């Protein structure tokens, strides 16, 4: 996260870390057995880390759980990043408490201007690379579809939204992918892609979770 602040330990109880011997993506807990993340974070060997603040120190409150399976959206397109969503089933059910809790799915899409909380352990630099130990947070509005499309003409599908600041200085960055975008208590977005980090007129692009609620529900029911 570039331009954000320290969240505070366990204040984003639905944030997960995907680990393969290092932190490579984020994700959100949506029930005791399932995490949502981005299709592009897809790899074998994933250990889901819940209740993490400092990802380098065991502090207490962590639960380390192997993914049992990862489900990339069948229509995911790695050139376009259209349908950039993935579900991960935990080998066993997390223990839900105040530190480790699930985020609700929206029942309707958010409008332009809604303020959301984005969070991750990704690079905190616009230029160069500086990874934090602790979770960082950012408040960012959802931009209008007109602005989003005039920033990335021919690249925005109806399953993507833009959020952030046209002025540069504040954004998600390398490391943050798969992580939540939460707006009024629901998960509206997934960190997906952009152009550099916190560059002027190049806001971050997010997966539009409201378009996937049925798919999520349907796939979880059958697995
Ligand atoms: N929000 C902004 N600006 N981002 C841009 C910096 C990468 C960030 C997250 C990251 C994975 O953790 N996503 C990407 O790597 C998905 N993706 C892969 C292909 C290239 C594309 N643009 S570049 O990396 O900035 C991109 O964003 C997203
Ligand atoms: Ca830790």
Please state whether 8 falls in left (phi above 0), alpha (psi between -120 and 50) or beta: left
| Domain ranges across the chain | 1-12+103-210, 13-102+211-223
Resolution of the determined structure in angstroms stands at 1.9
Distance 97 CA to ligand 1 centre (A): 32
Beta pairing partners, 15: 28
Give the CA distances from residue 184 to residues 41, 146, 164, 200, 215, in Å, rounded to whole numbers and listed in that order.
26, 23, 16, 27, 22
- Kindly calculate the radius of gyration of the chain based on its CA atoms and give it in whole angstroms: 16
Residue 11 CA, distance from chain mean position: 16
Beta carbons within 8 Å of 51's beta carbon, 6+ residues apart: 10, 13, 61, 62, 63, 99, 100
Its sign, for the CA torsion 76, 78, 84, 88, is positive
Annotated binding site for substrate: 171-172, 174-175, 177
Contact 18, 178 (CB under 8 A): yes
Catalytic residue positions, numbered: 40, 84, 177
Cβ of 175 closer than 6 Å to ligand 1, yes or no, is: yes
Residue 1's nearest CA partner among 164, 151, 187, 156 is: 164
Ligand nearest to the CA of 179: 1
Residue 158 CA, distance from chain mean position: 18
Token pair for residue 111?
């409008």
Cβ of 32 closer than 6 Å to ligand 1, yes or no, is: no
Contact 76, 39 (CB under 8 A): yes
Contact 219, 67 (CB under 8 A): no
CATH of 13-102+211-223, one of 3.40.50.2300, 2.70.98.10, 2.40.10.10, 1.10.3720.10: 2.40.10.10
Residue 124 phi/psi, 5-degree rounding, is -100, 5
Indicate which technique resolved this structure: X-ray
Beta carbons within 8 Å of 15's beta carbon, 6+ residues apart: 26, 28, 52, 119, 120, 135, 179, 180
Pick the residue whose CA is nearest to atom 19 on ligand 1. 193
Domains 1-12+103-210 and 13-102+211-223 equal at CATH topology level: yes
Cα separation, 175 vs 40, whole angstroms:
12
Beta carbons within 8 Å of 10's beta carbon, 6+ residues apart: 51, 53, 61, 98, 99
Contact 207, 39 (CB under 8 A): no
CB-proximal residues (5 Å) to ion ligand 2: 52, 54, 59
Contact 70, 42 (CB under 8 A): yes
Assign domain 1-12+103-210 to a CATH class.
mainly beta
């Amino acid at each position: 996260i570039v331009g954000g602040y320290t969240c505070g330990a366990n204040t984003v109880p639905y944030q997960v870390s995907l680990n393969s011997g290092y932190h490579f993506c984020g994700g959100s807990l949506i029930n005791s057995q399932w995490v949502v993340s981005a299709a592009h974070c897809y790899k074998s060997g994933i250990q889901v880390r819940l209740g993490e603040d400092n990802i380098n120190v065991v502090e207490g409150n962590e639960q380390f759980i192997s993914a049992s399976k990862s489900i990339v959206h069948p229509s995911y397109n790695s050139n376009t990043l259209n349908n950039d969503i993935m579900l991960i089933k935990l080998k066993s059910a997390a223990s839900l408490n105040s530190r480790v809790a699930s985020i609700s799915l929206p029942t309707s899409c958010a409008s332009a201007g809604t303020q959301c909380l984005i969070s991750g352990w990704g690079n905190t630099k616009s230029s160069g690379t500086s990874y934090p130990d602790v979770l960082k947070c950012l408040k960012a509005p959802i931009l209008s579809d007109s602005s989003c499309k005039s920033a990335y003409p021919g690249q925005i599908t109806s399953n993507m939204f833009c959020a952030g600041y046209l002025e540069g200085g504040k954004d998600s960055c390398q490391g943050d992918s798969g992580g939540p975008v939460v707006c009024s208590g629901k998960l509206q977005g997934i960190v997906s892609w952009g152009s550099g980090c916190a560059q002027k007129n190049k806001p971050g692009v997010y997966t539009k979770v409201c378009n996937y609620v049925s798919w999520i529900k349907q796939t979880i029911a059958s697995n």
